[PDB]
Amino acid sequence: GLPWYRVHTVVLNDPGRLIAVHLMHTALVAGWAGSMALYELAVFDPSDPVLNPMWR
């Protein structure tokens, strides 16, 4: 049938399903942005910006 590396080619000629998979990818990326921000805020130390800035 369709090997493991061609599996996302079924949505090649289905524009609605293509919009669906693009939406899912966008959802995952936005969720990553939010989750990364939350984790960073959880582990961030805002006390000392001159000797312990964000990049340290």
Partner: protein, 112 residues
């Protein structure tokens, strides 16, 4: 709020309004006086009420484990308004070269 105004209000009006925590004040109309301490007359303080309106804490400027520099930062009150002291009274005696007030009663503390 003046003491003359607190007498006018009943407990029902004052309850739940935050006016009980507020320290009174002497009116500008009734001012410019002089509470002279006559000899052969022992005097004392009463109703010494202290309302703190600003709270500041000397916090370290950084979370460094060896931080020695500190500055006064403003704070939010977490307890609701029970912080004002009231009812503080005590004698006025000639302990030393001048008069002195000795605190001996009243609410005189607030665990804020």
């Amino acid at each position: 709020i003046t003491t003359e105004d607190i007498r006018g209000l009943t407990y029902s009006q004052v309850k739940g309004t935050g006016l009980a925590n507020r320290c009174p004040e002497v009116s500008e109309q009734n001012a410019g006086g002089t509470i002279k301490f006559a000899d052969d007359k022992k005097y004392k303080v009463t109703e010494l009420c202290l309302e703190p309106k600003s709270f500041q804490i000397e916090e370290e400027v950084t979370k460094r484990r060896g931080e020695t520099k500190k500055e006064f930062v403003d704070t939010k009150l977490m307890t609701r308004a029970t912080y004002s002291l009231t009812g503080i009274e005590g004698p006025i005696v000639f302990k030393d070269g001048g008069l002195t007030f000795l605190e001996k009663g009243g609410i005189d503390y607030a665990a804020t």
